[PDB]
Amino acid sequence: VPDYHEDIHTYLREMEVKCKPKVGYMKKQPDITNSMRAILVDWLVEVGEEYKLQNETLHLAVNYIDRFLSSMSVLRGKLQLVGTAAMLLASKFEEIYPPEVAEFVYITDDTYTKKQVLRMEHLVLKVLTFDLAAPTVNQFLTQYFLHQQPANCKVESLAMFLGELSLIDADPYLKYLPSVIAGAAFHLALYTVTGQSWPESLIRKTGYTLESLKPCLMDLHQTYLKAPQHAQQSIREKYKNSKYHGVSLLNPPETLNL
Amino acid sequence: SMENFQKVEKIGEGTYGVVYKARNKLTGEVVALKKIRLTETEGVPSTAIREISLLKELNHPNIVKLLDVIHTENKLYLVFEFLHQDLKKFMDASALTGIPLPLIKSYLFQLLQGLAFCHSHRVLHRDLKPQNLLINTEGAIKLADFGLARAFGVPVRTYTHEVVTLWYRAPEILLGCKYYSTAVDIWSLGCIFAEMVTRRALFPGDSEIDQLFRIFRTLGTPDEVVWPGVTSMPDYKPSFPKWARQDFSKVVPPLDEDGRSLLSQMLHYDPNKRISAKAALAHPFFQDVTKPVPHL
Numbered sequence: 023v024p025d026y027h028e029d030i031h032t033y034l035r036e037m038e039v040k041c042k043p044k045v046g047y048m049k050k051q052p053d054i055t056n057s058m059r060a061i062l063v064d065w066l067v068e069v070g071e072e073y074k075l076q077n078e079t080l081h082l083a084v085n086y087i088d089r090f091l092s093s094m095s096v097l098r099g100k101l102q103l104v105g106t107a108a109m110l111l112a113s114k115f116e117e118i119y120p121p122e123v124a125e126f127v128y129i130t131d132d133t134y135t136k137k138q139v140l141r142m143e144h145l146v147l148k149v150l151t152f153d154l155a156a157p158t159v160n161q162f163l164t165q166y167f168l169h170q171q172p173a174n175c176k177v178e179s180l181a182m183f184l185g186e187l188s189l190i191d192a193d194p195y196l197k198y199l200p201s202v203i204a205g206a207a208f209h210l211a212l213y214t215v216t217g218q219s220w221p222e223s224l225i226r227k228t229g230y231t232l233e234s235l236k237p238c239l240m241d242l243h244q245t246y247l248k249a250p251q252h253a254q255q256s257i258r259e260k261y262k263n264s265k266y267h268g269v270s271l272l273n274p275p276e277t278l279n280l
Numbered sequence: 281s282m283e284n285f286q287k288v289e290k291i292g293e294g295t296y297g298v299v300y301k302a303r304n305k306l307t308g309e310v311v312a313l314k315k316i317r318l319t320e321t322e323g324v325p326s327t328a329i330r331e332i333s334l335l336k337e338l339n340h341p342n343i344v345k346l347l348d349v350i351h352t353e354n355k356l357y358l359v360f361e362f363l364h365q366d367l368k369k370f371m372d373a374s375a376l377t378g379i380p381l382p383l384i385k386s387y388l389f390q391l392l393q394g395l396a397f398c399h400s401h402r403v404l405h406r407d408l409k410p411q412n413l414l415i416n417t418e419g420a421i422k423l424a425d426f427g428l429a430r431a432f433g434v435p436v437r438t439y440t441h442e443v444v445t446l447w448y449r450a451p452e453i454l455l456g457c458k459y460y461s462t463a464v465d466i467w468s469l470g471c472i473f474a475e476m477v478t479r480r481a482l483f484p485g486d487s488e489i490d491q492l493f494r495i496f497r498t499l500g501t502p503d504e505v506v507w508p509g510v511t512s513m514p515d516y517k518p519s520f521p522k523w524a525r526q527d528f529s530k531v532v533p534p535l536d537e538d539g540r541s542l543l544s545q546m547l548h549y550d551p552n553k554r555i556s557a558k559a560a561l562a563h564p565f566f567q568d569v570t571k572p573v574p575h576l
Protein backbone atom coordinates (compact mmCIF):
# COMPACT_ATOMS: atom_id res chain seq x y z
CA VAL A 23 0.00 0.00 0.00
CA PRO A 24 2.41 2.73 -1.34
CA ASP A 25 1.25 5.42 1.19
CA TYR A 26 4.00 4.23 3.57
CA HIS A 27 6.33 2.25 1.25
CA GLU A 28 8.94 5.04 1.50
CA ASP A 29 8.58 5.62 5.29
CA ILE A 30 8.84 1.86 5.84
CA HIS A 31 11.93 1.37 3.62
CA THR A 32 13.67 4.35 5.26
CA TYR A 33 12.90 2.96 8.68
CA LEU A 34 14.08 -0.54 7.78
CA ARG A 35 17.34 1.07 6.51
CA GLU A 36 17.80 2.66 9.95
CA MET A 37 16.96 -0.56 11.86
CA GLU A 38 19.20 -2.91 9.86
CA VAL A 39 22.26 -0.98 11.10
CA LYS A 40 21.01 -1.26 14.69
CA CYS A 41 20.12 -4.95 14.26
CA LYS A 42 23.42 -5.93 12.62
CA PRO A 43 25.35 -8.75 14.30
CA LYS A 44 29.04 -8.18 14.99
CA VAL A 45 30.99 -8.92 11.80
CA GLY A 46 33.95 -10.67 13.40
CA TYR A 47 32.25 -12.66 16.18
CA MET A 48 33.20 -16.17 15.05
CA LYS A 49 36.90 -15.38 15.51
CA LYS A 50 36.02 -14.73 19.16
CA GLN A 51 34.11 -18.00 19.70
CA PRO A 52 36.32 -20.66 21.38
CA ASP A 53 34.35 -23.74 20.46
CA ILE A 54 32.34 -22.98 17.30
CA THR A 55 33.27 -22.20 13.72
CA ASN A 56 31.75 -20.86 10.48
CA SER A 57 31.25 -24.41 9.24
CA MET A 58 29.36 -25.45 12.38
CA ARG A 59 27.06 -22.42 11.91
CA ALA A 60 26.53 -23.46 8.26
CA ILE A 61 25.44 -26.88 9.47
CA LEU A 62 22.93 -25.34 11.89
CA VAL A 63 21.50 -22.90 9.30
CA ASP A 64 21.14 -25.75 6.81
CA TRP A 65 19.20 -27.75 9.40
CA LEU A 66 16.90 -24.79 10.12
CA VAL A 67 16.18 -24.63 6.38
CA GLU A 68 15.01 -28.28 6.68
CA VAL A 69 12.96 -27.48 9.78
CA GLY A 70 11.31 -24.62 7.88
CA GLU A 71 10.42 -27.02 5.05
CA GLU A 72 9.10 -29.79 7.32
CA TYR A 73 6.75 -27.45 9.15
CA LYS A 74 6.01 -25.25 6.08
CA LEU A 75 7.31 -22.08 7.77
CA GLN A 76 7.57 -18.72 6.03
CA ASN A 77 10.96 -17.86 4.52
CA GLU A 78 10.81 -14.67 6.65
CA THR A 79 10.80 -16.92 9.78
CA LEU A 80 14.04 -18.57 8.69
CA HIS A 81 15.69 -15.19 8.03
CA LEU A 82 14.59 -13.86 11.48
CA ALA A 83 15.90 -16.94 13.27
CA VAL A 84 19.35 -16.53 11.67
CA ASN A 85 19.37 -12.84 12.68
CA TYR A 86 18.59 -13.87 16.27
CA ILE A 87 21.33 -16.52 16.26
CA ASP A 88 24.01 -14.23 14.86
CA ARG A 89 23.13 -11.47 17.33
CA PHE A 90 23.03 -13.91 20.26
CA LEU A 91 26.46 -15.33 19.33
CA SER A 92 27.83 -11.79 18.86
CA SER A 93 28.05 -11.52 22.65
CA MET A 94 27.41 -15.02 24.06
CA SER A 95 30.05 -17.76 23.96
CA VAL A 96 28.53 -21.13 23.09
CA LEU A 97 29.91 -24.67 23.19
CA ARG A 98 29.25 -26.80 20.09
CA GLY A 99 26.88 -29.21 21.85
CA LYS A 100 24.63 -26.20 22.72
CA LEU A 101 24.53 -24.44 19.30
CA GLN A 102 21.49 -26.46 18.21
CA LEU A 103 19.77 -25.45 21.45
CA VAL A 104 20.46 -21.80 20.61
CA GLY A 105 19.09 -22.44 17.06
CA THR A 106 15.99 -24.27 18.19
CA ALA A 107 14.98 -21.49 20.63
CA ALA A 108 15.67 -18.84 17.91
CA MET A 109 13.38 -20.75 15.49
CA LEU A 110 10.69 -21.04 18.17
CA LEU A 111 10.95 -17.25 18.79
CA ALA A 112 10.96 -16.44 15.11
CA SER A 113 7.88 -18.65 14.64
CA LYS A 114 5.96 -17.02 17.51
CA PHE A 115 6.74 -13.53 16.09
CA GLU A 116 6.02 -14.27 12.43
CA GLU A 117 3.70 -17.30 11.90
CA ILE A 118 -0.07 -17.38 12.02
CA TYR A 119 0.21 -20.94 13.42
CA PRO A 120 3.68 -21.57 14.92
CA PRO A 121 4.62 -25.21 15.72
CA GLU A 122 4.19 -26.01 19.40
CA VAL A 123 7.17 -26.32 21.77
CA ALA A 124 6.74 -30.16 21.74
CA GLU A 125 7.30 -30.18 17.97
CA PHE A 126 10.52 -28.13 18.47
CA VAL A 127 11.62 -30.62 21.19
CA TYR A 128 10.87 -33.53 18.84
CA ILE A 129 12.96 -32.24 15.88
CA THR A 130 16.10 -31.99 17.99
CA ASP A 131 15.55 -35.81 18.23
CA ASP A 132 15.36 -35.50 22.03
CA THR A 133 18.89 -34.03 22.21
CA TYR A 134 17.40 -31.45 24.60
CA THR A 135 14.41 -31.27 26.99
CA LYS A 136 11.37 -28.98 26.84
CA LYS A 137 12.66 -27.27 29.98
CA GLN A 138 16.00 -26.58 28.27
CA VAL A 139 14.30 -25.13 25.15
CA LEU A 140 12.10 -22.82 27.25
CA ARG A 141 14.95 -21.69 29.44
CA MET A 142 17.00 -20.98 26.31
CA GLU A 143 14.07 -19.03 24.82
CA HIS A 144 14.09 -16.83 27.93
CA LEU A 145 17.87 -16.42 27.65
CA VAL A 146 17.72 -15.46 23.99
CA LEU A 147 14.99 -12.86 24.81
CA LYS A 148 17.16 -11.40 27.61
CA VAL A 149 20.24 -11.21 25.43
CA LEU A 150 18.36 -9.59 22.55
CA THR A 151 16.43 -7.39 25.03
CA PHE A 152 13.18 -8.55 23.34
CA ASP A 153 14.18 -6.73 20.17
CA LEU A 154 12.87 -9.28 17.63
CA ALA A 155 11.38 -7.10 14.87
CA ALA A 156 14.51 -7.19 12.72
CA PRO A 157 14.81 -6.33 9.01
CA THR A 158 15.79 -9.24 6.77
CA VAL A 159 17.03 -9.84 3.27
CA ASN A 160 13.47 -11.05 2.60
CA GLN A 161 11.82 -7.80 3.72
CA PHE A 162 14.04 -5.78 1.31
CA LEU A 163 13.65 -8.14 -1.68
CA THR A 164 9.92 -8.04 -1.45
CA GLN A 165 10.07 -4.23 -1.79
CA TYR A 166 12.59 -4.41 -4.67
CA PHE A 167 10.25 -6.86 -6.51
CA LEU A 168 7.71 -4.03 -6.97
CA HIS A 169 10.15 -2.37 -9.38
CA GLN A 170 10.02 -5.18 -11.99
CA GLN A 171 8.52 -4.30 -15.39
CA PRO A 172 6.76 -6.59 -15.60
CA ALA A 173 6.88 -8.99 -12.62
CA ASN A 174 8.70 -12.25 -13.26
CA CYS A 175 8.00 -15.19 -10.95
CA LYS A 176 11.36 -16.81 -11.71
CA VAL A 177 13.20 -13.54 -11.01
CA GLU A 178 11.46 -13.45 -7.61
CA SER A 179 12.09 -17.07 -6.62
CA LEU A 180 15.69 -16.99 -7.84
CA ALA A 181 16.36 -13.77 -5.86
CA MET A 182 14.92 -15.48 -2.75
CA PHE A 183 17.03 -18.60 -3.39
CA LEU A 184 20.19 -16.48 -3.61
CA GLY A 185 19.38 -14.41 -0.49
CA GLU A 186 18.82 -17.66 1.36
CA LEU A 187 22.23 -19.09 0.34
CA SER A 188 23.78 -16.00 1.90
CA LEU A 189 22.41 -17.15 5.25
CA ILE A 190 24.62 -20.29 5.22
CA ASP A 191 28.06 -18.68 5.04
CA ALA A 192 29.01 -16.12 7.75
CA ASP A 193 32.21 -15.45 5.83
CA PRO A 194 31.68 -13.39 3.88
CA TYR A 195 27.95 -12.49 4.27
CA LEU A 196 28.07 -11.21 7.85
CA LYS A 197 29.87 -8.11 6.54
CA TYR A 198 26.97 -7.13 4.28
CA LEU A 199 23.70 -5.47 5.39
CA PRO A 200 20.36 -7.16 4.52
CA SER A 201 19.51 -4.35 2.04
CA VAL A 202 22.82 -4.84 0.15
CA ILE A 203 22.56 -8.69 -0.05
CA ALA A 204 18.99 -8.20 -1.34
CA GLY A 205 20.14 -5.74 -4.00
CA ALA A 206 22.92 -8.11 -5.16
CA ALA A 207 20.52 -11.09 -5.19
CA PHE A 208 17.85 -9.13 -7.09
CA HIS A 209 20.33 -7.91 -9.72
CA LEU A 210 21.87 -11.37 -9.99
CA ALA A 211 18.39 -12.99 -10.41
CA LEU A 212 17.22 -10.45 -12.92
CA TYR A 213 20.40 -10.65 -14.98
CA THR A 214 20.36 -14.49 -14.88
CA VAL A 215 16.78 -14.82 -16.06
CA THR A 216 16.14 -11.82 -18.30
CA GLY A 217 19.56 -10.23 -19.05
CA GLN A 218 18.32 -7.00 -17.45
CA SER A 219 20.11 -4.93 -14.80
CA TRP A 220 19.53 -3.25 -11.42
CA PRO A 221 16.87 -0.67 -12.40
CA GLU A 222 17.33 3.10 -12.23
CA SER A 223 14.14 3.30 -10.10
CA LEU A 224 15.95 1.25 -7.38
CA ILE A 225 18.99 3.55 -7.56
CA ARG A 226 16.63 6.44 -6.69
CA LYS A 227 14.99 4.39 -3.90
CA THR A 228 18.07 2.79 -2.26
CA GLY A 229 20.91 5.02 -3.42
CA TYR A 230 22.80 1.81 -4.32
CA THR A 231 24.42 1.44 -7.74
CA LEU A 232 25.95 -1.56 -9.41
CA GLU A 233 29.29 -0.08 -8.30
CA SER A 234 28.28 0.05 -4.66
CA LEU A 235 26.77 -3.45 -4.93
CA LYS A 236 29.85 -4.92 -6.72
CA PRO A 237 31.67 -6.29 -3.63
CA CYS A 238 28.54 -8.24 -2.53
CA LEU A 239 27.66 -9.19 -6.12
CA MET A 240 31.04 -10.85 -6.72
CA ASP A 241 30.77 -12.87 -3.54
CA LEU A 242 27.21 -13.87 -4.38
CA HIS A 243 28.11 -14.76 -7.98
CA GLN A 244 30.80 -17.13 -6.67
CA THR A 245 28.42 -18.65 -4.13
CA TYR A 246 25.94 -19.13 -6.94
CA LEU A 247 28.54 -20.86 -9.19
CA LYS A 248 29.80 -23.18 -6.41
CA ALA A 249 26.37 -23.94 -4.97
CA PRO A 250 26.19 -27.55 -6.40
CA GLN A 251 29.46 -28.35 -4.56
CA HIS A 252 28.75 -26.69 -1.17
CA ALA A 253 28.64 -29.15 1.74
CA GLN A 254 25.17 -27.80 2.66
CA GLN A 255 22.48 -28.55 0.06
CA SER A 256 19.11 -28.04 1.74
CA ILE A 257 18.40 -24.65 0.12
CA ARG A 258 19.16 -26.07 -3.37
CA GLU A 259 16.75 -29.00 -2.78
CA LYS A 260 14.06 -26.75 -1.36
CA TYR A 261 14.33 -24.48 -4.43
CA LYS A 262 13.78 -27.44 -6.80
CA ASN A 263 10.12 -27.34 -5.74
CA SER A 264 7.39 -26.04 -8.02
CA LYS A 265 6.40 -23.59 -5.28
CA TYR A 266 9.69 -21.77 -6.08
CA HIS A 267 9.48 -22.55 -9.83
CA GLY A 268 12.42 -24.94 -9.68
CA VAL A 269 14.81 -21.95 -9.85
CA SER A 270 17.73 -23.84 -8.30
CA LEU A 271 17.98 -25.86 -11.54
CA LEU A 272 18.69 -22.68 -13.54
CA ASN A 273 22.26 -22.23 -14.76
CA PRO A 274 24.19 -19.34 -13.22
CA PRO A 275 25.77 -16.90 -15.73
CA GLU A 276 29.50 -17.43 -16.31
CA THR A 277 30.26 -13.71 -16.24
CA LEU A 278 28.54 -10.66 -14.78
CA ASN A 279 30.39 -8.17 -16.95
CA LEU A 280 30.54 -5.35 -14.40
CA SER B 281 12.49 -7.07 41.21
CA MET B 282 9.01 -5.68 41.82
CA GLU B 283 10.08 -4.38 45.24
CA ASN B 284 9.81 -0.70 44.28
CA PHE B 285 6.23 -1.06 43.05
CA GLN B 286 3.21 -0.75 45.34
CA LYS B 287 0.06 -2.22 43.85
CA VAL B 288 -2.93 0.09 44.03
CA GLU B 289 -5.80 -1.73 42.28
CA LYS B 290 -6.57 -4.05 39.39
CA ILE B 291 -7.52 -2.17 36.21
CA GLY B 292 -8.64 -5.10 34.07
CA GLU B 293 -7.86 -7.76 31.51
CA GLY B 294 -6.99 -7.11 27.88
CA THR B 295 -5.88 -9.38 25.05
CA TYR B 296 -3.70 -11.32 27.43
CA GLY B 297 -2.49 -11.02 31.03
CA VAL B 298 -3.81 -8.75 33.79
CA VAL B 299 -3.23 -5.00 34.29
CA TYR B 300 -2.87 -3.26 37.67
CA LYS B 301 -2.35 0.34 38.73
CA ALA B 302 0.80 0.59 40.82
CA ARG B 303 3.14 3.32 42.06
CA ASN B 304 6.92 3.46 42.10
CA LYS B 305 7.77 4.02 45.76
CA LEU B 306 11.04 5.76 45.03
CA THR B 307 10.10 8.21 42.23
CA GLY B 308 6.40 8.58 42.92
CA GLU B 309 5.49 7.59 39.34
CA VAL B 310 2.09 5.99 38.92
CA VAL B 311 2.30 3.05 36.45
CA ALA B 312 0.19 0.38 34.78
CA LEU B 313 1.61 -3.08 35.43
CA LYS B 314 0.78 -5.78 32.94
CA LYS B 315 1.29 -9.16 34.59
CA ILE B 316 1.88 -12.26 32.48
CA ARG B 317 1.93 -15.67 34.19
CA LEU B 318 4.33 -18.00 32.35
CA THR B 319 7.50 -23.65 31.44
CA GLU B 320 5.51 -26.82 30.55
CA THR B 321 3.16 -24.49 28.65
CA GLU B 322 4.36 -22.98 25.39
CA GLY B 323 6.80 -20.50 26.99
CA VAL B 324 6.57 -16.72 26.34
CA PRO B 325 3.29 -16.10 24.42
CA SER B 326 3.44 -14.73 20.87
CA THR B 327 1.18 -11.83 21.89
CA ALA B 328 3.76 -10.75 24.52
CA ILE B 329 6.73 -11.21 22.22
CA ARG B 330 4.98 -9.00 19.63
CA GLU B 331 3.66 -6.33 22.03
CA ILE B 332 7.11 -5.86 23.61
CA SER B 333 9.34 -5.89 20.51
CA LEU B 334 6.93 -3.58 18.73
CA LEU B 335 6.21 -1.19 21.64
CA LYS B 336 9.96 -0.78 22.27
CA GLU B 337 10.19 0.67 18.71
CA LEU B 338 7.12 2.93 18.96
CA ASN B 339 7.87 5.93 21.10
CA HIS B 340 5.16 8.51 20.27
CA PRO B 341 2.93 10.84 22.34
CA ASN B 342 -0.23 8.99 21.17
CA ILE B 343 0.98 5.45 21.81
CA VAL B 344 1.07 4.08 25.32
CA LYS B 345 4.70 4.16 26.47
CA LEU B 346 6.38 0.93 27.54
CA LEU B 347 8.82 1.89 30.30
CA ASP B 348 10.37 -1.40 31.38
CA VAL B 349 10.15 -5.18 31.13
CA ILE B 350 10.71 -7.21 34.33
CA HIS B 351 11.39 -10.84 33.65
CA THR B 352 11.67 -13.54 36.30
CA GLU B 353 11.47 -17.36 35.70
CA ASN B 354 7.76 -17.43 36.66
CA LYS B 355 6.34 -14.04 35.77
CA LEU B 356 6.75 -11.34 33.18
CA TYR B 357 5.74 -7.76 34.06
CA LEU B 358 5.42 -4.91 31.56
CA VAL B 359 5.65 -1.45 33.05
CA PHE B 360 3.61 1.18 31.17
CA GLU B 361 2.88 4.87 31.74
CA PHE B 362 -0.49 5.04 33.53
CA LEU B 363 -3.51 6.49 31.81
CA HIS B 364 -6.61 7.62 33.75
CA GLN B 365 -9.42 5.94 31.85
CA ASP B 366 -10.70 4.50 28.55
CA LEU B 367 -12.77 6.18 25.81
CA LYS B 368 -15.59 3.72 26.31
CA LYS B 369 -15.99 4.67 30.00
CA PHE B 370 -15.65 8.35 29.06
CA MET B 371 -18.39 8.12 26.40
CA ASP B 372 -20.67 6.37 28.92
CA ALA B 373 -20.00 9.27 31.36
CA SER B 374 -20.78 11.88 28.67
CA ALA B 375 -24.32 10.45 28.56
CA LEU B 376 -25.98 13.85 29.00
CA THR B 377 -23.49 16.47 27.81
CA GLY B 378 -22.41 14.64 24.72
CA ILE B 379 -18.78 15.10 23.77
CA PRO B 380 -17.94 18.63 22.67
CA LEU B 381 -16.92 18.72 18.99
CA PRO B 382 -13.49 20.29 19.82
CA LEU B 383 -12.66 17.26 22.03
CA ILE B 384 -13.88 14.76 19.41
CA LYS B 385 -11.73 16.52 16.80
CA SER B 386 -8.72 16.62 19.08
CA TYR B 387 -9.08 12.90 19.94
CA LEU B 388 -9.49 11.89 16.34
CA PHE B 389 -6.50 14.04 15.31
CA GLN B 390 -4.35 12.52 18.02
CA LEU B 391 -5.46 8.95 17.19
CA LEU B 392 -4.59 9.48 13.55
CA GLN B 393 -1.09 10.68 14.54
CA GLY B 394 -0.64 7.58 16.70
CA LEU B 395 -1.83 5.32 13.91
CA ALA B 396 0.18 7.07 11.15
CA PHE B 397 3.24 6.49 13.34
CA CYS B 398 2.42 2.72 13.69
CA HIS B 399 1.77 2.27 10.00
CA SER B 400 4.97 4.26 9.00
CA HIS B 401 6.87 1.79 11.26
CA ARG B 402 5.25 -1.25 9.60
CA VAL B 403 2.98 -2.11 12.58
CA LEU B 404 -0.75 -3.00 12.25
CA HIS B 405 -2.69 -2.61 15.51
CA ARG B 406 -5.68 -4.76 14.54
CA ASP B 407 -7.78 -4.17 17.68
CA LEU B 408 -8.77 -0.54 17.74
CA LYS B 409 -11.88 0.02 19.92
CA PRO B 410 -12.93 2.56 22.57
CA GLN B 411 -11.79 0.16 25.35
CA ASN B 412 -8.17 0.19 23.98
CA LEU B 413 -7.95 4.00 23.61
CA LEU B 414 -6.86 5.63 26.83
CA ILE B 415 -7.20 9.22 28.00
CA ASN B 416 -5.54 11.38 30.63
CA THR B 417 -6.62 14.59 32.50
CA GLU B 418 -4.44 16.73 30.21
CA GLY B 419 -6.45 16.00 27.07
CA ALA B 420 -4.25 13.28 25.53
CA ILE B 421 -5.56 10.06 23.98
CA LYS B 422 -3.26 7.09 23.27
CA LEU B 423 -3.43 3.72 21.47
CA ALA B 424 -3.09 0.85 23.92
CA ASP B 425 -3.19 -2.97 24.03
CA PHE B 426 -0.86 -4.00 21.21
CA GLY B 427 -1.53 -7.65 22.09
CA LEU B 428 -3.09 -8.19 18.67
CA ALA B 429 -0.59 -6.08 16.69
CA ARG B 430 1.97 -7.32 14.24
CA ALA B 431 4.82 -6.22 11.98
CA PHE B 432 3.88 -6.29 8.31
CA GLY B 433 5.79 -6.38 5.05
CA VAL B 434 5.67 -4.43 1.85
CA PRO B 435 3.70 -5.56 0.13
CA VAL B 436 1.67 -7.57 2.65
CA ARG B 437 1.24 -11.31 2.65
CA THR B 438 -1.60 -13.22 4.35
CA TYR B 439 -1.95 -12.65 8.11
CA THR B 440 -4.27 -13.98 10.79
CA HIS B 441 -7.91 -13.90 9.68
CA GLU B 442 -9.48 -13.82 13.14
CA VAL B 443 -8.70 -10.17 13.75
CA VAL B 444 -10.37 -6.99 15.10
CA THR B 445 -13.34 -6.98 17.47
CA LEU B 446 -16.43 -7.59 15.33
CA TRP B 447 -18.11 -4.16 15.67
CA TYR B 448 -14.86 -2.50 14.43
CA ARG B 449 -14.00 -5.07 11.78
CA ALA B 450 -13.41 -4.00 8.14
CA PRO B 451 -15.47 -5.44 5.26
CA GLU B 452 -12.36 -6.87 3.55
CA ILE B 453 -11.78 -9.08 6.62
CA LEU B 454 -15.49 -10.04 6.85
CA LEU B 455 -15.41 -10.99 3.14
CA GLY B 456 -12.31 -13.13 3.56
CA CYS B 457 -9.73 -11.19 1.53
CA LYS B 458 -6.36 -12.94 1.61
CA TYR B 459 -4.63 -9.59 1.87
CA TYR B 460 -5.61 -6.92 4.34
CA SER B 461 -3.37 -3.98 5.30
CA THR B 462 -3.22 -0.67 7.19
CA ALA B 463 -6.68 0.28 5.88
CA VAL B 464 -8.26 -2.13 8.48
CA ASP B 465 -7.10 0.15 11.29
CA ILE B 466 -8.56 3.23 9.51
CA TRP B 467 -11.94 1.41 9.22
CA SER B 468 -11.90 0.86 12.98
CA LEU B 469 -11.01 4.50 13.61
CA GLY B 470 -13.87 5.62 11.35
CA CYS B 471 -16.36 3.52 13.35
CA ILE B 472 -14.92 5.11 16.46
CA PHE B 473 -15.26 8.65 15.05
CA ALA B 474 -18.96 7.97 14.36
CA GLU B 475 -19.31 6.51 17.85
CA MET B 476 -17.81 9.52 19.60
CA VAL B 477 -20.39 11.65 17.79
CA THR B 478 -23.51 9.49 18.41
CA ARG B 479 -22.17 7.80 21.58
CA ARG B 480 -23.25 4.40 20.25
CA ALA B 481 -21.60 1.82 18.05
CA LEU B 482 -22.05 2.46 14.35
CA PHE B 483 -22.33 -1.24 13.42
CA PRO B 484 -23.16 -3.40 16.52
CA GLY B 485 -23.52 -6.77 14.74
CA ASP B 486 -23.91 -10.00 16.69
CA SER B 487 -22.42 -12.33 14.04
CA GLU B 488 -20.30 -11.94 10.91
CA ILE B 489 -23.23 -11.84 8.48
CA ASP B 490 -25.17 -9.50 10.75
CA GLN B 491 -22.05 -7.27 10.81
CA LEU B 492 -21.83 -7.24 7.00
CA PHE B 493 -25.57 -6.56 6.54
CA ARG B 494 -25.42 -3.67 9.01
CA ILE B 495 -22.52 -2.17 7.07
CA PHE B 496 -24.34 -2.80 3.72
CA ARG B 497 -27.58 -1.12 4.95
CA THR B 498 -25.60 1.98 5.85
CA LEU B 499 -23.09 2.39 3.03
CA GLY B 500 -24.91 0.43 0.32
CA THR B 501 -24.20 -3.14 -0.73
CA PRO B 502 -20.89 -2.89 -2.64
CA ASP B 503 -20.69 -3.95 -6.32
CA GLU B 504 -17.92 -3.96 -8.96
CA VAL B 505 -18.43 -0.24 -9.60
CA VAL B 506 -17.76 0.92 -6.00
CA TRP B 507 -15.24 -1.83 -5.15
CA PRO B 508 -13.58 -3.57 -8.13
CA GLY B 509 -13.01 -7.23 -7.24
CA VAL B 510 -15.66 -7.54 -4.43
CA THR B 511 -17.78 -10.15 -6.20
CA SER B 512 -14.72 -12.41 -6.51
CA MET B 513 -14.02 -12.27 -2.75
CA PRO B 514 -14.12 -15.68 -0.96
CA ASP B 515 -17.18 -14.92 1.23
CA TYR B 516 -19.12 -12.67 -1.12
CA LYS B 517 -22.49 -14.18 -2.00
CA PRO B 518 -24.54 -13.15 -5.08
CA SER B 519 -27.58 -13.70 -2.79
CA PHE B 520 -26.59 -10.68 -0.59
CA PRO B 521 -29.48 -8.18 -0.38
CA LYS B 522 -28.79 -5.09 -2.47
CA TRP B 523 -29.30 -2.07 -0.23
CA ALA B 524 -29.12 1.54 -1.40
CA ARG B 525 -26.44 3.75 0.15
CA GLN B 526 -27.63 6.16 2.85
CA ASP B 527 -26.74 9.85 2.64
CA PHE B 528 -24.13 10.47 5.41
CA SER B 529 -25.86 13.44 6.85
CA LYS B 530 -28.25 10.74 8.06
CA VAL B 531 -25.53 8.34 9.26
CA VAL B 532 -24.14 10.83 11.80
CA PRO B 533 -26.63 13.73 11.91
CA PRO B 534 -24.66 16.13 14.23
CA LEU B 535 -21.69 16.04 11.83
CA ASP B 536 -20.98 19.04 9.60
CA GLU B 537 -19.74 18.85 5.98
CA ASP B 538 -15.95 18.48 6.61
CA GLY B 539 -16.73 15.81 9.27
CA ARG B 540 -18.91 13.77 6.99
CA SER B 541 -16.38 14.08 4.20
CA LEU B 542 -13.60 12.66 6.44
CA LEU B 543 -15.80 9.86 7.83
CA SER B 544 -16.82 8.81 4.32
CA GLN B 545 -13.15 8.52 3.27
CA MET B 546 -12.35 6.44 6.39
CA LEU B 547 -15.32 4.08 5.59
CA HIS B 548 -14.59 3.72 1.87
CA TYR B 549 -15.18 0.10 0.78
CA ASP B 550 -12.08 -0.30 -1.41
CA PRO B 551 -9.11 -0.54 1.01
CA ASN B 552 -6.98 0.97 -1.77
CA LYS B 553 -9.10 4.13 -1.89
CA ARG B 554 -9.76 4.33 1.87
CA ILE B 555 -7.81 7.30 3.27
CA SER B 556 -4.51 6.73 5.15
CA ALA B 557 -3.87 8.16 8.61
CA LYS B 558 -1.09 10.33 7.21
CA ALA B 559 -3.29 11.91 4.51
CA ALA B 560 -6.18 12.34 6.96
CA LEU B 561 -4.15 14.64 9.22
CA ALA B 562 -4.37 17.32 6.49
CA HIS B 563 -8.14 17.00 6.11
CA PRO B 564 -10.09 20.32 6.39
CA PHE B 565 -11.99 18.86 9.36
CA PHE B 566 -8.86 19.54 11.36
CA GLN B 567 -8.22 23.22 10.39
CA ASP B 568 -9.29 24.57 13.79
CA VAL B 569 -8.06 21.69 15.92
CA THR B 570 -6.99 22.48 19.46
CA LYS B 571 -6.35 20.29 22.48
CA PRO B 572 -9.10 20.69 25.08
CA VAL B 573 -8.72 19.07 28.46
CA PRO B 574 -11.70 16.66 28.90
CA HIS B 575 -14.44 17.14 31.53
CA LEU B 576 -13.46 14.47 34.11
Ligand SMILES: Oc1ccc(Nc2nc(OCC3CCCCC3)c3nc[nH]c3n2)cc1
Binds near residue numbers: 295344362363414
Ligand atom coordinates in the same frame (compact mmCIF):
# COMPACT_ATOMS: atom_id res chain seq x y z
O1 LIG C 1 -10.73 2.50 33.18
C1 LIG C 1 -9.42 2.62 33.10
C2 LIG C 1 -8.68 3.19 34.12
C3 LIG C 1 -7.29 3.28 33.98
C4 LIG C 1 -6.67 2.77 32.84
N1 LIG C 1 -5.32 2.86 32.71
C5 LIG C 1 -4.53 2.10 31.91
N2 LIG C 1 -4.98 0.90 31.47
C6 LIG C 1 -4.26 0.08 30.68
O2 LIG C 1 -4.72 -1.13 30.26
C7 LIG C 1 -5.90 -1.67 30.86
C8 LIG C 1 -6.59 -2.60 29.86
C9 LIG C 1 -7.98 -2.97 30.40
C10 LIG C 1 -8.78 -3.85 29.43
C11 LIG C 1 -8.73 -3.37 27.97
C12 LIG C 1 -7.31 -3.00 27.52
C13 LIG C 1 -6.69 -1.98 28.47
C14 LIG C 1 -2.92 0.53 30.29
N3 LIG C 1 -1.91 0.00 29.53
C15 LIG C 1 -0.92 0.98 29.59
N4 LIG C 1 -1.21 2.11 30.35
C16 LIG C 1 -2.49 1.81 30.79
N5 LIG C 1 -3.30 2.57 31.57
C17 LIG C 1 -7.43 2.19 31.83
C18 LIG C 1 -8.79 2.12 31.96
Ligand SMILES: [Mg+2]
Binds near residue numbers: 048049052053054055
Ligand atom coordinates in the same frame (compact mmCIF):
# COMPACT_ATOMS: atom_id res chain seq x y z
MG1 LIG D 1 35.87 -20.09 16.55
